[PDB]
Amino acid sequence: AGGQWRLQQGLAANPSGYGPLTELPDWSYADGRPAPPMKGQLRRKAERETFARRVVLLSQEMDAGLQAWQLRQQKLQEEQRKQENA
Amino acid sequence: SSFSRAPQQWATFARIWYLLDGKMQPPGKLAAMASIRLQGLHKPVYHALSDCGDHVVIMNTRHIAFSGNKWEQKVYSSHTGYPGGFRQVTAAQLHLRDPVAIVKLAIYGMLPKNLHRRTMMERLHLFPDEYIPEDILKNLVEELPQPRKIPKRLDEYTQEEIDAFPRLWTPPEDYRL
Amino acid sequence: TARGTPSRFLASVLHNGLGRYVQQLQRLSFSVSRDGASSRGAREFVEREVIDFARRNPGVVIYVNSRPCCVPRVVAEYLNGAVREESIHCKSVEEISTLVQKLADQSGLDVIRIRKPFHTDNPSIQGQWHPFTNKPTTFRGLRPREVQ
Amino acid sequence: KFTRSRIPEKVFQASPEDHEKYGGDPQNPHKLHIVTRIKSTRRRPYWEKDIIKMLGLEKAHTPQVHKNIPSVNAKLKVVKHLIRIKPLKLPQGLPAEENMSNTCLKSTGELVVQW
Amino acid sequence: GYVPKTSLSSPPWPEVVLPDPVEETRHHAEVVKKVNEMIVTGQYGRLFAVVHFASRQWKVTSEDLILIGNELDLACGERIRLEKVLLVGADNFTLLGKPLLGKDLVRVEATVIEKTESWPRIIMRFRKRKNFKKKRIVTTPQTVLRINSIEIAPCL
Amino acid sequence: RRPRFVSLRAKQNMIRRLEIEAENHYWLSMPYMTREQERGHAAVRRREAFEAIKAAATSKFPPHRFIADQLDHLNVTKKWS
Amino acid sequence: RRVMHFQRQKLMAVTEYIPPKPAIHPSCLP
């Protein structure tokens, strides 16, 4: 039990976390063709996929918010110049 | 190793007689080692219900050494059952009275508190002095190391290791030493 | 409960997968009443599922008869002599197909507590442990505190 | 009585000694927080049970991502003692519409593609 | 620096200094070659492997059985190969992965001999004085894998 | 009796938690935006999500009923002949 | 001199003053 050491070396604290043990296919057929993947692997792919989609969505929203703020600063700081003529 | 069935089974679960000296050893350390060996907690094949306990033979039990002032403070207590029969006796007294009892009580305390305890204590042999019966000498197999290293006094330091150590200070010469 | 139940050790019939796998179920008897209401799922199974099962398992002799007259049942016989009855009265065709496959997919041993989940006949390769492994030896084989 | 705690802002002021002690930087801060729960909501006031139920931190460790904007920090400053916050690191950039199903989050907090 | 010998100057453990790596690498290569030449000539007997499977680490050897508590969607008697070998050993040598052994170095074959449902298990909850009593019966399924061969190859 | 004797293991556990929360303090003294910059950037998503909740809540209604399901119940007397 | 809740006890123990070790021991050096 070396969770401290494993996290000090960029590994999962729990050897049953992410690693060759948990996600490589536990078996193949005798001939060589691979096996229908295991349920746990499917569920972890789905959850990691959802995590990535959420990451990209939140980052996009924050960047778009920054751009919207830039636009508003432009159209309020410069449209006051239209009142500086005539 | 290709042994037949019955010989293999006998070889794996057999009992081994461990000697263990006790000269200038504290009762507790001998007790710890004896507890481990009697219980069977030195066998990779251990289990509680397999009766893998071994034999232990502690000699020189008269010569143990108690840390500190325990001789004058550690009080063993007993009660006969009859009124007024509550006897409290120090370690020095109980050592003179029965030179084996201190180590026996240590090992009795450490062992587990179940029915097996008595059986394990039937495999503890404690002999006060160097003498051991022949029928028990002819059974020993190993000789567990003493757990305390007997510090050695000036009487057994050779002049080599006495003059090897430096002389840390200078006396005056007028002084009478 | 465990204490209140028999037990056995993990085993196979005739070292089944060692040389060649053999299918233990060898006979399967269906009794299906032609009229009873409880024999409806059984009638569906015989009408549209038993031929395919017979084709997929040619080592099993499947008999079906129509003389319980009120209650169906399936009696599975195995190579090792064991018999095993199962009720199919008042069950669906899905349930009967699942059950019959389950019968054809197991060895006829008793369904009781398997004490060990791993059975090995050669558990040791380097020699099973005995108190003299990992223990030294001394000159002339002397016991401690000897003289000669 | 026992009351909500208003943490003075003085504590949330990274010093020149803190900055080189954790892998951060005053300028160019980090987009997303990865947050995990390392303590029970039980035995704590309801105004922390609700916050945790709102940040999606109901389950145990099970990391979850949130924006690094003050509207969420105000919530994390109430539950800062039942969570570990680390900054998500993207040393390969946001994934594309390809590589969404082949991502992975390492214990150091870096999101990467194809393990 | 110098300190005269006492009971605490040095600690009570020995100063174990490791061999110089330059020679140690040669020694390791030599012993690796020795083990390899043992493998090539068939200088071994029965083998055993530490195979990782459903979630468990089974210590197995040829002709033995294993019981997995989860159905494995395999017909009766379909040979399969068990990847994830953590350790494979013979009488004189044994190979340790970090943490797995390559797909080429070790080949473990198994077969599905029986699929069935375990013996009925009881789940009963009870609490005193609250009229709380409930009983459930569960039969988790399971399958018996026979292990047919542990073969090794001289790829070191 | 009533007083206790706080061990060393407990001190180390408490210091572990104190360090974790000090790191938490650090990772909260630098926000990506400010109060005013963020304002509104999530309005569209929030509105659409609540509209999804509304459309879910306002769709409750009994399920359909088919003649086939009713007439299938006559199968409970199907016989061979 | 009443007893403290246990968690207050741990807090008092962890926050206990630790003094700065002197560079040298005065006995064997001024």
Next chain:
RNA sequence: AUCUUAGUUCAACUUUAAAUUUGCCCACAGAACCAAAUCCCCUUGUAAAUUUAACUGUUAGUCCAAAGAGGAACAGCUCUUUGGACACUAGGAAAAAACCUUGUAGAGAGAGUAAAAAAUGAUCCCAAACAUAUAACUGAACUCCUCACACCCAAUUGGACCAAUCUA
């Protein structure tokens, strides 16, 4: 509130069905002259909240942290308030409702952790021991792992099944 405090009715809380759209958290602004915090909302994280139809059930609980009033600032004392726990699971402090850790439930002969060890008067003392071999390890029904999932609260309320008998 009650010829009422051994009970009832109303409210508050709970449950079901149904309709609709905002509910909670929340910065800045704002609330008097004579310390903790509280109230109120834009955003933000969320998915809940209000309304309608229809019933029962609970109600003046114990302990712990805190601020007060009464009895010392005590009598393990009566009472008010903010919070937690209990009356629900599990692991710890010796036994342990009330302290610390932990919740959503099944199988595993897998794994990582949480809390968690003492310092220097009256029957019969009460674990046994240990000064110095490198700090890590141990430790749950928490979490991960392979498979399966409706399958751990009282009063109450909703739902799915059903033993045996009679009749068509």
Next chain:
RNA sequence: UCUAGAGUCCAUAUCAACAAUAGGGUUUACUGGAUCAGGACAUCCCGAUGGUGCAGCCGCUAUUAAAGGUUCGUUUGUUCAACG
């Protein structure tokens, strides 16, 4: 525990005032006796020791000691008290 006040001189041979530090209770107004007794010591006696202002047995205090012992009667019964 400070002795500070005394004691024919002098705090320590005795009380030792207030206070402080300790162990222990205070319920009413606007349950004994016989029988058998188990136990603690904070000791009444017996035992051992220190000082004494006992110049000595005994006295006085102080330390230690729980193996043993710790009476019979008149009057009366919140259970005690008085008396031989």
Next chain:
RNA sequence: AGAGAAAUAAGGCCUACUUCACAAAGCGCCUUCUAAAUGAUAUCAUCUCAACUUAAUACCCACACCCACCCAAGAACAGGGUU
């Protein structure tokens, strides 16, 4: 340091007295085992949480029966004797 005498407590007995009478008893009888010396830390000194030296036996104790009778043994069972 001894010697007598008495009581009590425990244990036991019945020769005498006493109540009684093949015996059981007491009111009777018997037995009971903290002051020194040397001396350092602190060279004198100092009794030393300095080293160091001084101030209970007795009792029980036979592997192998038991029908009958007797008994100072006894509730039954056990125990002693039957030459």
